[PDB]
Paper text:
Testis ACE (tACE) is identical to the C-terminal half of somatic ACE, except for a unique 36-residue sequence at its N-terminus. The final structure contains a zinc ion, one SeCap inhibitor molecule, N-glycosylated carbohydrates at two potential binding sites (Asn72, Asn109) and 54 water molecules. No noticeable conformational change in the protein is observed upon inhibitor binding. The topological arrangement of the final structure is consistent with previously determined structures of tACE, as well as tACE in complex with captopril. One bound SeCap molecule was unambiguously fitted in the catalytic site of tACE with the aid of a clearly observed electron-density map. The inhibitor SeCap molecule makes a direct interaction with the catalytic Zn2+ ion (distance 2.5 Å) deep inside the active site channel, similar to the zinc coordination in tACE–captopril. This interaction results in the formation of a zinc–selenolate complex. The inhibitor is anchored through the central carbonyl group and the proline carboxylate group. The proline residue of SeCap interacts with the S2′ subsite of the active site via two strong hydrogen bonds from two histidines (His513, 3.1 Å; His353, 2.6 Å). One oxygen atom of the proline carboxylate group is held by interactions with Tyr520 (2.7 Å), Gln281 (2.7 Å) and Lys511 (3.0 Å).
Human angiotensin I-converting enzyme (ACE; EC3.4.15.1) is a zinc metallopeptidase that plays a critical role in blood pressure regulation by catalysing the proteolysis of angiotensin I to the vasopressor angiotensin II. Because selenium compounds are known to exhibit better antioxidant behaviour than their sulfur analogues, we have recently reported the synthesis, characterization and antioxidant activity of a number of selenium analogues of the clinically used ACE inhibitor captopril. It was shown that selenium analogues of captopril (SeCap) not only inhibit ACE activity, but also can effectively scavenge peroxynitrite, a strong oxidant found in vivo. Here, we report for the first time, structural details on the binding of one of the potent SeCaps to tACE and AnCE, as elucidated by X-ray crystallography at 2.4 and 2.35 Å resolution, respectively. Captopril is one of the smallest ACE inhibitors and with both ACE and AnCE, key interactions of the selenium analogue's central carbonyl and proline carboxylate anchor the inhibitor in the cavernous S1′S2′-binding site of the enzyme.
Author numbering: 40 to 434, 439 to 617
Write the structure that this text describes.
């Protein structure tokens, strides 16, 4: 009966703690030291963790969730009925694990070598190149090189990963893996919800896109930039053209109101990775949110190790399910871009900390977008000129439009990219897209949503999606599209809670205890209630809505329209 359901839930949570704890360490030992031994150990703890998942998932399914009074118990047991990969037969489960690990190693150890010299790693050698070069051919070298090395080598692994994860999903009662992922939002209208949100941010993006294309035309020359066509994917200052802030100089609305070189200022002033995470820590405490435990500074990996040992460089935050041990792993570089990433990751840690008293089953984000948005909200305030000037990294209507542009190159530009990744991935999981149409359909979406074309035509053998961490790493990506919309909603709520008046882009919530209180009450819920309840606690209303973001950039939209009009731009790509 009911009494048996809660004994079960209590038994699940305590054994899950221990086992999830042993898994995370082994996972961490591999991530921060990629070698054969750590892999072998990670592969072994995988069987263990699966042995545990099966035992408890099998039991959970013997419960009729319908007969259960307590909703909290209802929801845990229902979640425990999802075995994930552990639904797989033992041989396929061991193959599946091997595939993932092989895909992750492949991605993380890949290099792009000059004919007779330097071999370059994605972080930060290729990343730096993408950000800083303005020579069409060097950009192309790195763009194509990364795709030829990480992309192509992921291709051999992907169709079978796809086969196995779909089988896992069908074995857990889903139609395919994407359906399973989407299910994490508990929102049957998810797809239409996101599509409507995407349509709302269009005038803003089409206008950004056209303005940026006009500037690229001006720097790279008419022969390379068609003013009525897609932008070559390699000129946006970022390996994936996902954020465009690194070409700010080429696009600056008013060079007449020049801005400081932040990276100069950071390096010159003895900024360090440690100091960047310490300032993020300080920002969270200014709000009366939790500080990171001493142990965090002992255990984290906040910069690229010097050992000559391979690591997964891509930033991640780690909950050890201890209530005590929390870590970040980042190959942090000293620039403004990674300052923002350090806040993003610190929002993860803060979320682990707020909900650490919940049962581990419910130790997760209200939805995955919420988990991604926390740190970004604070970073919206960090990124203000008034906050940046106080960090000694910066020094007036002109400056205001420059700021919004800077922010727009980061935030608006990512909207179609974050929409596209899982539009392609869902259509792969459900069979619309086969290993023969992988790359072509990836670029039909790059064109449709982002207005990009590949600068080099793609050939059979290319698997460009394999060149983005999340594909080989099998981490869903819609979470980030949801993150970008909602964080603006959170920022607007927190700003009004903090008493601030007038144009929303001028808000800085540093030290606002009222804002900290809203986020905290929301984060403590973990995954115990459906997300609209947290949405409500923060914003006073239950929906996702693009309105705050439209409102944040409204002055920029006006300026972009005027400006694209007078140059006679033709928005979009025919
Ligand atoms: C269904 O079962 C759950 C889980 O056993 C019940 O939720 C739990 O309810 C207790 C008592 O309301 C909560 O404790 C409270 O929270 C804090 C910290 O523990 C404390 O300071 C308060 O004074 C109070 O004791 C507990 O947090 C809560 N647990 C969870 C995971 O939500 C729930 O009440 C049951 N529902 C019904 C309708 O009986
Ligand atoms: C890398 O792995 C080896 C052997 O598996 C281990 O002894 C060593 O501690 C690891 N290196 C670092 C820096 O942790
Ligand atoms: C910060 C992370 C690691 Se959780 C990340 O991967 N981000 C942050 C936003 C989307 C994105 C990306 O790399 O593309
Ligand atoms: Cl690409
Ligand atoms: Cl997600
Ligand atoms: Zn994140």
């Amino acid at each position: 009966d009911e009494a048996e359901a809660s004994k079960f839930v209590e038994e699940y949570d305590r054994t899950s703690q221990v086992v999830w704890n042993e898994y995370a360490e082994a996972n961490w030992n591999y991530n921060t030291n990629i070698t054969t031994e750590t892999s072998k150990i990670l592969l072994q703890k995988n069987m263990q963790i699966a042995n545990h998942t099966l035992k408890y998932g099998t039991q959970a399914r013997k419960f009729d969730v319908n007969q259960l009074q307590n909703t909290t118990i209802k929801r845990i047991i229902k979640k425990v009925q999802d075995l994930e990969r552990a639904a797989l037969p033992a041989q396929e489960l061991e193959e599946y694990n091997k595939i993932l690990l092989d895909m992750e190693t492949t991605y993380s150890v890949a290099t792009v070598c000059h004919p007779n010299g330097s071999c370059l790693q994605l972080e930060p050698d290729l990343t730096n190149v993408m950000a800083t070069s303005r020579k069409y051919e060097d950009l192309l070298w790195a763009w194509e090189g990364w795709r030829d090395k990480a992309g192509r080598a992921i291709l051999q692994f992907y169709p079978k990963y796809v086969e196995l994860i779909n089988q896992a999903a069908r074995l857990n009662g889903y139609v395919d893996a994407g359906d399973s992922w989407r299910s994490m939002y508990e929102t049957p209208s998810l797809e239409q919800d996101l599509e409507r949100l995407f349509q709302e941010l269009q005038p803003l993006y089409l206008n950004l896109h056209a303005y940026v294309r006009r500037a690229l035309h001006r720097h790279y020359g008419a022969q390379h930039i068609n003013l009525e066509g897609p932008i070559p994917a390699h000129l946006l200052g970022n390996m994936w053209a996902q954020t465009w802030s690194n070409i700010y100089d080429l696009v600056v609305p008013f060079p007449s109101a020049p801005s400081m070189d932040t990276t100069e200022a950071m390096l010159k002033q003895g900024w360090t990775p440690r100091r960047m995470f310490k300032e993020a820590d300080d920002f969270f405490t200014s709000l009366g949110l939790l500080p990171v435990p001493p142990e965090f500074w002992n255990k984290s990996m906040l910069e690229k190790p010097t050992d000559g040992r391979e690591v997964v460089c891509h930033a991640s935050a780690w909950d050890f399910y201890n209530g005590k041990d929390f870590r970040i792993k980042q190959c942090t570089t000293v620039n403004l871009e990674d300052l923002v990433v350090a806040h993003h990751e610190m929002g993860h840690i803060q979320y682990f900390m707020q909900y650490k008293d919940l049962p581990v089953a419910l130790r997760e984000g209200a939805n995955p977008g919420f988990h991604e948005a926390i740190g970004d909200v604070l970073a919206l305030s960090v990124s203000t000129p008034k906050h940046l000037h106080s960090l000694n990294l910066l020094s007036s209507d002109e400056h205001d439009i420059n700021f919004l542009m800077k922010m727009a190159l980061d935030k608006i530009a990512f909207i179609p990219f974050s929409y596209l990744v899982d539009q392609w991935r869902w259509r792969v999981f459900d069979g619309s897209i086969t290993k023969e149409n992988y790359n072509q359909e990836w670029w039909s979406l790059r064109l449709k949503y982002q207005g990009l074309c590949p600068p080099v035509p793609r050939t059979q053998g290319d698997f460009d999606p394999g060149a983005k961490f999340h594909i080989p790493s099998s981490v869903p990506y819609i979470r980030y599209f949801v993150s970008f919309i909602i964080q603006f909603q959170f920022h607007e709520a927190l700003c009004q809670a903090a008493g601030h008046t007038g144009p929303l882009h001028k808000c800085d919530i540093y030290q606002s205890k009222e804002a900290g209180q809203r986020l905290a009450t929301a984060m403590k819920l973990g995954f115990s209630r459906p997300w609209p309840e947290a949405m409500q606690l923060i914003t006073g209303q239950p929906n996702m809505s693009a309105s705050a973001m439209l409102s944040y950039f409204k002055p920029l939209l006006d300026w972009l329209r005027t400006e694209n009009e007078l140059h006679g731009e033709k928005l979009g790509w025919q």
